[PDB]
Swiss-Prot record:
Family: Belongs to the histone H2A family.
Species the sequence originates in: Homo sapiens
PTM-bearing positions, type N6-crotonyllysine: K26
Post-translational modification: It is involved in the initiation of both imprinted and random X inactivation. Ubiquitinated H2A is enriched in inactive X chromosome chromatin. Ubiquitination of H2A functions downstream of methylation of 'Lys-27' of histone H3 (H3K27me). H2AK119Ub by RNF2/RING2 can also be induced by ultraviolet and may be involved in DNA repair.
Chain positions with N6-(2-hydroxyisobutyryl)lysine modification: K26
Cross-link (Glycyl lysine isopeptide (Lys-Gly) (interchain with G-Cter in ubiquitin)) at residue(s): K3, K5
Gene, per the UniProt record: H2AC4
Quaternary structure annotation from Swiss-Prot or TrEMBL: The nucleosome is a histone octamer containing two molecules each of H2A, H2B, H3 and H4 assembled in one H3-H4 heterotetramer and two H2A-H2B heterodimers. The octamer wraps approximately 147 bp of DNA.
Positions spanned in the full protein: 12 to 65 of 130
Annotated protein name in UniProt: Histone H2A type 1-B/E
Length: 54
DNA sequence: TGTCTACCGCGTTTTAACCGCCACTAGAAGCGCTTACTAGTCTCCAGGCACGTGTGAGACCGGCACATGAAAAAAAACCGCGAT
């Protein structure tokens, strides 16, 4: 077993990719969620958050 | 209430929408095959949570500087009130 890296850290993100993936699966949005989707969405939430906080 | 003209109604001339048709093919959409990718499961462990604690940001207050509104009064101007 390799030592674990957060999906956020591989994406270069502060926002939780894994939490976002989970919220997509459990939110009744579709039957299946691709691996990119929460990465993209997490990034967008970070960008907008950054912009308001700026 | 009074003044000005922008809109409305109308008859005439102009325009191109519409319809029905035909000719051509881009691309919408169906179908079978194959695999990459996701769900699912198990095990493991660290990210993020609830909890606790301090200290400095911010709320509050008094004192003062300063901006600005309104009055009183001084200075312009203007709007008539009726004359050769
Ligand atoms: Ca960003
Ligand atoms: Ca920015
Ligand atoms: Ca096509
Ligand atoms: Ca920790
Ligand atoms: Ca906390
Ligand atoms: Ca101290
Ligand atoms: Ca502090
Ligand atoms: Ca200090
Ligand atoms: Cl994806
Ligand atoms: K839904
Ligand atoms: K495929």
């Amino acid at each position: 077993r390799a030592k674990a890296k957060t999906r956020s850290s591989r994406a270069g993100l502060q926002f939780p990719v894994g939490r976002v993936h989970r919220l997509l699966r459990k939110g009744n949005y579709s039957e299946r969620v691709g691996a990119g989707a929460p990465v993209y969405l997490a990034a967008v939430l970070e960008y907008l958050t950054a912009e308001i906080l700026e």
